[PDB]
């Protein structure tokens, strides 16, 4: 219990120091590569261990002469590096090692002195998520810790830490009586579905190679409707908000809908909280939760969930006709939306309703690839309850040996370009951009050898402006087709952001933990994979060019955004 | 250079800890294995390593009202352990002091709980503790297991000296002297220092040797004058001898002549006052009216005619007794030279064969091997990367990283080395042999133990009740009462040396990083004395006493020099 406090707050500190120096230390130039002049206060132990220094010594120096002390496994301009020692803080006196929410204290008052801006909402908020996350390794820290890689729900009923460069990863304000373990999924939580009975009039269902039943029947079974009427499904916190609502309980009142309680299938939710995984079911269920997870209430719009079947059928048609400029894409369908608003609504009520009730069947891949071969991606590259790297014992079990360089790098190549090769090529070629950040990619592997990187989620798919746009039929509603819309610029900074920074750093940190020599080797290859795709686009790719010159790439801000500066650049790999 | 000094004031402050932990600690019941109640000072990262904890939390509660933290990877009866944490002091919160200020808290502890102060012994700890670190600075670039690779490398590589000792590099001669050009561990060579005396002062103990023999084992004796000899000593020595009033006489009536650093050039070994020449068939063994680490480094001249009869008694024991000696190797000490003034008197001819004293070691490695022989006190101490230097030695030569079995395996071939020999000495004929570290070689093939060679004869004893037996009638009363010890005298110096000089470090070299082989070890060596008791032509009682766990006597190195008894105190057996 003592261990898992320890445990949390190494964690949530070492999240919040990623934050620090990919925002603000390495654009800024608060970073230093240096022993302080003066090192009283910062124990021997701290920084060496009897044969060498531990690592390399990193120096931050903040405008409010704040100065923090950490050493570090290697120089990376990503700002992706192992902790080796604890952090020490000195002020404008000498070097202290602060408990850990006082620290945090000094080191958030430190940045809004940067930003300019203050905020006490997000320092309740980074306390909060860390005690939750002592209370997931106090759950967690019983089974073997990386049991999490060996099912594709024990991955996603596994990422104990969240987003590993983020203030606040854990931060949820469930409604006021809840408590955070309830609809957790780090505490394997299940749940029957909650239903309603719903008149067929009010429905608005989108369908790709399915009729609106099956549709219908993907969401809930349908037998307890009467005739007139279909069933839907809702989360069960969802639910409850919903029935708080007047127009809601009107039509409760006036028998129009019924509740049906929590009568629905049992489903366990994912690492993403609104959506739900059935084991023997062809779907997940994706619905609405009005709930601010990581500082922000995510709901699916009217139009969001328009735009969804059109990204399907698209995707469907690309996969089908145009294979052999998709770099082997693999992706998961999302064939049905469902929604409901009364027929004789007006707008505003229609689209509120609409929001409520919403909900998105998203094929359950698993069916074809087997649990025990599917590894949610941030899991995969995320740290156990013991602190590790999760994939380094993972893949000594696999291979039958501990790994060594040469097979780590093979591992890393056969991984890079089953991610780099699908993306780049929807961009580049169609206009298409995906979102393949951690969350929304899936391993598929035969013992431990990379297959696929499966992508997920069509609800941030972006069509680009000058290419992109030409699937989109000029009868779309405006609304849904400014929904879809990015620049070409806007497409290639998120591209940047995700692929390299949230997606690559962290797999090539994980792979390389006691073997920091192993990184620029990585990104060495990272580079000449993306001299191959270059050569293998159809359309002109510029901005593919700029990146492996060394140009700067585009970082998206996680604390800074929080003291507003939604961007940052960070100097190249190579 | 900085990296240089952190080492050395670890290796420093560690050792400190062994004495205090040995001498005060777990004889006084002063150490418990727990955490402290409040932690308030100590930082995660002393105790915690991301997952649990850094091994197990060691308390020590001084009567001063100071309270020690650190973590240790293991229990140990003989406070044999690796620390796995910096030290912390409570008296207040939890404090981690510098060195130099730690080190005055941790001694004034103990001069508390000896109620003396020693300010004396405190310099003397800083002093050796810059040298560890000149040291350091100027071999911590080769590689660490370097040391194990050759005989020579071997004695000029114990960077640290005795890891139970507080100041273990301190030598104390006038600092105009220099230490590098003396230092073993800095390499260094350097001409002996030689004087030219009248035969008729000479007095040279020879065993199958001419006394002529032993002159020229000593040095070459063609530029002798006609009725003078030569004879070498310590050029730091030379100059101590000079201070001397009777010495400037002599020189000033061309009695004697300073022939200057005019001998052999040599190579200090890690003993300081023993030179080694690789061509040469001899170690040369100077006296050295200095103190280092505890003693005074000089023979008094009852000793240089012990070392003659002891020389002997190994040639007799050998010659007839052979099987009942556990396969004994040892390096014969067969010439032994002094000088005093033919028509001095007792006083003055007494000290100045104490002054010119030396001793001829044969020069064993040429039989046995560079490459394969291996001080023993270096053979389980640390690199300069302050690790084991033995584990990436076994693992070069058992081309395999080595499993528990093969750890327990060499280590039952070593002890079984060094126990038959010396306990078959003590019990079939009552020689006390003095088997500490820096007494005793490894021989390997290919690391394997083959033999473990003994070798000092200085400190060597005779029993009243048995080793009596080998002295003669015409032999002096001062030599006869230097040999002589009580045989409980004689066990219970044995048992220190054996068990807690020796096997104890042994042990902890050899399980780093795998504290549960200890006890499995210790095993081994019951069951080994079971064994050799088997063996044994005499009685034996007091091995079944130890065999059935009774407390064992340990030499102090801290509590011998705060006190005016307290050489020795007990530990707890490890079985």
Redesign the interface.
Known sequence: DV?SR??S??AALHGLLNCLIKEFAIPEGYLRYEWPDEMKGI????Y?D????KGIPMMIGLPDQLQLFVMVDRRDTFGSQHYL??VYLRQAGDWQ?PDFEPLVARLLAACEHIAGRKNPELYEQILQSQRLVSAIVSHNGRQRADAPLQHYLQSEQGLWFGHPSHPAPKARLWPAHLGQEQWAPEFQARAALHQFEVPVDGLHIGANGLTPQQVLDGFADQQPASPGHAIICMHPVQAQLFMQDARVQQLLRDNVIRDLGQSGRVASPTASIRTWFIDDHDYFIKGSLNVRITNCVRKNAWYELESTVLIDRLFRQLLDQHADTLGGLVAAAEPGVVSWSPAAAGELDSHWFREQTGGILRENFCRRTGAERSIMAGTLFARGV???PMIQTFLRTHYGEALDDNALLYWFDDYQTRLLRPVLSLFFNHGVVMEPHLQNSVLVHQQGRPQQVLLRDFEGVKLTDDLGIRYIDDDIHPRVRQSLLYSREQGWNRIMYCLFINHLSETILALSQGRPQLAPLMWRRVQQQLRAIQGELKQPSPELDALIAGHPVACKTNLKVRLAASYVRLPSPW
């Open positions: 261990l320890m445990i707050e190494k124990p021997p132990g701290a060496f009897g044969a060498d220094w020692s604890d090692c013991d602190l590790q």
